[PDB]
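User: Predict the full complex structure for these chains.
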Amino acid sequence: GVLKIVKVYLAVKRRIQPGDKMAGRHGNKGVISKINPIEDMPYDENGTPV
Amino acid sequence: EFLKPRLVDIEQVSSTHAKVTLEPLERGFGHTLGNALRRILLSSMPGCAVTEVEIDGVLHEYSTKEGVQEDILEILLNLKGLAVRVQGKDEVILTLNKSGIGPVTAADITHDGDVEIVKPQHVICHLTDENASISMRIKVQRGRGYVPASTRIHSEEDERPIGRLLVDACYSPVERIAYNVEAARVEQRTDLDKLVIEMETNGTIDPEEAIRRAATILAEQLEAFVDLRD
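Assistant: Here is the predicted structure of the two-chain assembly.
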């Protein structure tokens, strides 16, 4: 019944955003709640932010 | 009864790393200025970054060139890091054309007057074939902050050319900023402090100009803020 077929592959680049699920190797899990600017994040004495 | 901070010695340990000190700080404003400056520096420093790339034989980020080893996507990722200083104009189109076996670094880009390539050693690609030749045009814009590929579509303006390869724009030269307030004991005075701002950047903005521009922006916002028209 099918005359012809056309398949099309889309490549979508999905960026991390709020609501994705992240986990560790030890069973710790969580939802990404908010993405803060680099400034707001705590920073070490040396100045490297977490 | 107050004092004022004057820009005193501004040492540069490396091309990227700079220490800027402010000696005559009254008690209590060490931390206030440290923090305000840190915030503005990290958020608002205007810088240049690669916005788009056109390579001839490549329709989309996923295909591959003959005779090269990095994928097109990885070449884009490498171009994202290219630190370039444009003086007068806002949008420059650099052209990289190299052939033969060898690692094509950023230095091989055709050097235009107004453009300065801060780190010529930055690697771009590795050729693997005597006749393999790559030509491309990298379009670099001026901008502040962070604009992704997906947002820039709003200003599409007839993006019809499928050859155009969008890169996320990290429009920010300041990598790291820390401040240390230490008592600056001057032989005739009781309680004065020095701010030592240690700043690491990709080698585009000079420290003095960064600090000045930050103070400018803060001053403008405080101007607007002080007056209150009910």
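The domain at 46-171 of chain B is CATH 2.170.120.12 (RNA Polymerase Alpha Subunit; Chain A, domain 2).
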